[PDB]
Design a protein around this ligand. Structure first.
Ligand code: 7AX
Lengths: 401, 547
């Protein structure tokens, strides 16, 4: 009920960002939604004296036919002053199960600092630029802004105080418009506790971190090796030598001596088997000296493995993975690569939020124009990460497969 | 006197850390001075301006050409940024046909809109007196000045704010607002239409706005922004192509621009050969000769622009269809229509700048472009007709390392068809010869060697002058392709070559790569394997090409 003063970073003007085109249905949805919000005082129409603009579009969350308004507050977020800090709950990732809740509706109760409101300006676009877009600005705390959870921290603490005093074994974390709740209960008891907590938030997505871990580098086990098998093996070991110190391939390379046919079977020497065994033993151990630096960006690389399968690696320094994984989940995405990639990016981002409390910078295996054309059609998340585009095929593709 | 409604001003501030403009007034002839005096007298009588005292430090230069001209460039440099709604323009193909369309121009346009009084003191300007033996006559604006930065945006927003209730009260008619013109339309009868036009200009008159009293000064066809707008159809204004035996760079730019403009409705417009001459620009004076390709292309452009073609308007009750054709040399053309033979609009796509490429990728890019354009113009994605088989697209996107997608589309058979020219094996080939290739080059002498050894004892090493490591590594693979059967396995240590080939080009800027491609096309089965160099891997011989 009392506005807290908010400014920008020194030497930075408010965001001016081109609004990209929308389909007619998304436009109509946004018109309806924003009309209602205007009737509720959450937003207000502005004049030409406001140069600032932030992109906006519409989505549909899981198990809901109701359109939702999503604002790409990325530029405003990086232009907004740093807000202060709560140390990340390192036990959240260690918990058996975690449920994510949408606490966005809460923000609209708290009013936004007047002087700052002109920076949250957005435009509902029109088809074919027929009539000028509908320009609004926010009066209350907007969803997607990084200042909104920072301001509501005290309120959220006050609301969740009894529940925290009730169950000390339940971990509670907050990121943007989402509230992550971790525990070790049973799925039924979990869901009932979630109904309890959501009812506790009312009067005022099952995710299991334990079923996800890091992944090792495995080598084939064969009774018979062809020249091709040994060549690929040597390639993989040579690559993995960039990560593990003691990997040697000279005894295996010794088998390839001479020029033979790729399909010809070569029996392994004892030295070769020994070398391979040692390499296995080495790969079984974790990676030497791998730490997390909060001052460094998180980078995520994604490879398309085909047949709905995808591999990914989260790291900071090259060959120093903090997390690795393989998304192969198929829901309704069978005929569409882009949908799969988008859902994969969302899942990886979510995992990243659970582990470190921030999103990674993605390196997507897709052409810029394709991604930029289609990614908003399959995006159900309230936040957005940063991304770049790799136009050169990586050779390491099958080395994670 | 009927009390016309006022208009709320738009608050305007100068850019932060800046102060209002102060500029020395230019010396003027006595004639000019008298003219400016009479004009500014009339304007002051109208209320557009007002005399001010000596207190105001700010001043703007004024000229006479009689018509007065206030140079607000400095104030524009010092005035705040505004939200401009003119980014992009409505495309005629996006308009929906109406039985009646009337035009009301807003004479007394900017001068009917009040300016924020706190800002008026920054628009101050002076008139030099005769012989300068008296203090100059000081004036300030009370309305939106012509040439000011904030005039168009404020005017547009004001007019919108005024028009909103009438539009809400008349959903059965559509009103478009562009600069100093209003375009009204309706599917009603002509009498009811003219009636509602009278109602509208009355509603506007309530705020003290004037529209043409006589029969409206403009009637179809409408000449607007290079377009001709007829009742049943739209097209572009007639083309102008200069013909001279000596061409400059600027002339090339103008020609390219006009051809690109004409290409949105005239199908088959090609602009590559003339755009290739725009390398090494920034020099507007030069003489650039024509190739036979460029001359034949321009002749074909004069062939297409020979007879007029018209686009139609948009009917939402019918599907939206976009058909694509390959033209060659990275050129693509497309038509967007609803009924066959009746285009809504046309267009072209040129491949981007790259070392290697294939037809499927370019097709994908073209589709993306048309998709974006279509969402801009009609707010939906059209159904596509593509010259590519379903099976081809299937194989491509299933085996492509990148993620890729095309919206709903069907196969139209209109050659040339986009096809996959070759496909690499996923596994080594049984009974196929195994060529271990390698190439090396000396960084100093630019001398190198490329060759292969095989499992059957076949060997070759070829010496090369003026070459690099990458070139010799490609040359080795090419050699293996030349001297092998319809089925072949190839082992290389070149990450470069493997990258290039795994990118799957059907065409390249490098002749050697093109020759390798032509080799791949002739083959039945090709397996390309990779191994690390200098690992002592048997059969892979750096020692053979390093001599
Ligand atoms: N911004 C902007 C802008 C600029 C110029 C315009 C010219 C005519 C026009 O016209 C229209 C105005 C209101 C509603 C529907 C319109 O056009 C549908 C197609 N059409 C056209 C011309 C004609 O004679 N008959 C027709 O059926 C709308 C315009 C809008």
């Amino acid at each position: 009920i009392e506005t807290v003063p908010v400014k920008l970073k020194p030497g930075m003007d408010g965001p001016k960002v081109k609004q990209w085109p929308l389909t007619e249905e998304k436009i109509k949805a946004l018109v309806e939604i924003c009309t209602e919000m205007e009737k509720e005082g959450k937003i207000s129409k502005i004049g030409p004296e406001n140069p600032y603009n932030t992109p906006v579009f519409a989505i549909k969350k899981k198990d809901s036919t109701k359109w939702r308004k999503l604002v790409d507050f990325r530029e405003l977020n990086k232009r907004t002053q740093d807000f202060w800090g709560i140390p990340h709950p390192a036990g959240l990732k260690k918990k058996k199960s975690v449920t994510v809740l949408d606490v966005g509706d809460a923000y609209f109760s708290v009013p936004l600092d007047e002087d700052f409101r002109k920076y949250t300006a957005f435009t509902i676009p029109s088809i074919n630029n027929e009539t000028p877009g509908i320009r609004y600005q926010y009066n209350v705390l907007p969803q997607g802004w990084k200042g909104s959870p920072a301001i509501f921290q005290s309120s959220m603490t006050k609301i969740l105080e009894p529940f925290k005093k009730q169950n000390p074994d339940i971990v509670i974390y907050q990121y943007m418009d989402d509230l992550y709740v971790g525990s070790d209960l049973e799925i039924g008891q979990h869901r009932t506790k979630i109904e309890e907590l959501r009812q506790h938030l009312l009067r005022w997505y099952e995710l299991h971190p334990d079923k996800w871990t890091v992944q090792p580098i495995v080598l084939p086990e064969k009774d018979s090796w062809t020249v091709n098998d040994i060549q690929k093996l040597v390639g993989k070991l040579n690559w993995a030598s960039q990560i593990y110190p003691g990997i040697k391939v000279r005894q295996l390379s010794k088998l390839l001596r001479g020029t033979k046919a790729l399909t010809e079977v070569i029996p392994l020497t004892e030295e070769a088997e020994l070398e391979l065994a040692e390499n296995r033993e080495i790969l079984k151990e974790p990676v030497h000296g791998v730490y997390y630096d909060p001052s460094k960006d998180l980078i995520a690389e994604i490879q398309k493995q085909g047949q709905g399968q995808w591999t990914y690696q989260i790291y900071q320094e090259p060959f120093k993975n903090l997390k690795t994984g393989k998304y192969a989940r198929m829901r309704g995405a069978h005929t569409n690569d882009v949908k799969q990639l988008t859902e994969a990016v969302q899942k990886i981002t979510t995992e990243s939020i659970v582990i470190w409390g921030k999103t990674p910078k993605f390196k997507l295996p897709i052409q810029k124009e394709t991604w930029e054309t289609w990614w908003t059609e399959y995006w159900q998340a309230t936040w957005i990460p940063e991304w770049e585009f790799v136009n050169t095929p990586p050779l390491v593709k099958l080395w994670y497969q | 006197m009927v009390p016309i409604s006022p208009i709320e001003t738009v608050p305007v501030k100068l850019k932060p850390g800046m102060d209002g403009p102060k500029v020395k007034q230019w010396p003027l002839t006595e004639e000019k001075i008298k003219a400016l005096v009479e004009i500014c007298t009339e304007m002051e009588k109208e209320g557009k301006i007002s005399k001010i005292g000596p207190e105001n430090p700010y001043n703007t230069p004024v000229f006479a050409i009689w018509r007065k001209l206030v140079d607000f460039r400095e104030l524009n440099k010092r005035t705040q940024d505004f939200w401009e709604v003119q980014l992009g323009i409505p495309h005629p193909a996006g308009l929906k046909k109406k039985k009646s369309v009337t035009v009301l121009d807003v004479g007394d346009a900017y001068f009917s809109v009040p300016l924020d009084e706190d800002f008026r003191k920054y628009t101050a300007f002076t008139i030099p007196s005769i012989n300068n033996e008296t203090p100059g006559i000081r004036y300030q604006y009370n309305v939106l000045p012509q040439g000011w930065k904030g005039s168009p945006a404020i005017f547009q927003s004001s007019m919108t704010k005024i028009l909103e209730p009438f539009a809400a009260q008349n959903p059965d008619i559509v009103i478009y607002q562009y600069m100093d013109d209003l375009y009204v339309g309706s599917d009603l009868e002509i009498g009811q239409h003219r009636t509602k036009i009278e109602e509208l200009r009355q509603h506007l008159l309530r705020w003290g706005l004037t529209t043409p009293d006589k029969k409206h000064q403009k009637e179809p066809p409408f000449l607007w922004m290079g377009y001709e707008l007829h009742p049943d159809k739209w097209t572009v204004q007639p083309i102008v192509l200069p013909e001279k035996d000596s061409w400059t760079v600027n002339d090339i730019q103008k020609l390219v621009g006009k051809l690109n403009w004409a290409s949105q409705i005239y199908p088959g417009i090609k602009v590559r050969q003339l755009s290739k001459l725009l390398r090494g620009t920034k020099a507007l004076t030069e003489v650039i000769p024509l190739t036979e390709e460029a001359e034949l292309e321009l002749a074909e452009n004069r062939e297409i622009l020979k007879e007029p073609v018209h686009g139609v308007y948009y009917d939402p009750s019918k599907d939206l269809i976009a058909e694509i054709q390959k033209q060659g040399q990275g050129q693509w053309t497309y038509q967007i229509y609803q009924e066959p033979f009746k285009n809504l609009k046309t267009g072209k796509y040129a491949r981007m700048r790259g070392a290697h490429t294939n037809d499927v990728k370019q097709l994908t890019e073209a589709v993306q472009k048309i998709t974006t354009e279509s969402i801009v113009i009609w707010g939906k994605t059209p159904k596509f007709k593509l010259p590519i088989q379903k099976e081809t697209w299937e194989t491509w996107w299933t085996e492509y390392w990148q993620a890729t997608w095309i919206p709903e589309w069907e196969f139209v058979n209109t050659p040339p068809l986009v096809k996959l020219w070759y496909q690499l094996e996923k596994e080594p080939i049984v009974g196929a010869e195994t060529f271990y290739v390698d190439g090396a080059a000396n960084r100093e002498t630019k001398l190198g060697k490329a060759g292969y050894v095989t499992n059957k004892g076949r060997q070759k090493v070829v010496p090369l002058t003026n070459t690099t490591n990458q070139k010799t590594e490609l040359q080795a693979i090419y050699l293996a392709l030349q001297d092998s059967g319809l089925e072949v396995n190839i082992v290389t240590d070149s990450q470069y070559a493997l990258g290039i080939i795994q990118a799957q080009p059907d065409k390249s800027e490098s002749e050697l790569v093109n020759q390798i491609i032509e080799q791949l096309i002739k083959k039945e089965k090709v397996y390309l394997a990779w191994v690390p160099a200098h690992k002592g891997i048997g059969g892979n011989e750096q020692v053979d090409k390093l001599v």
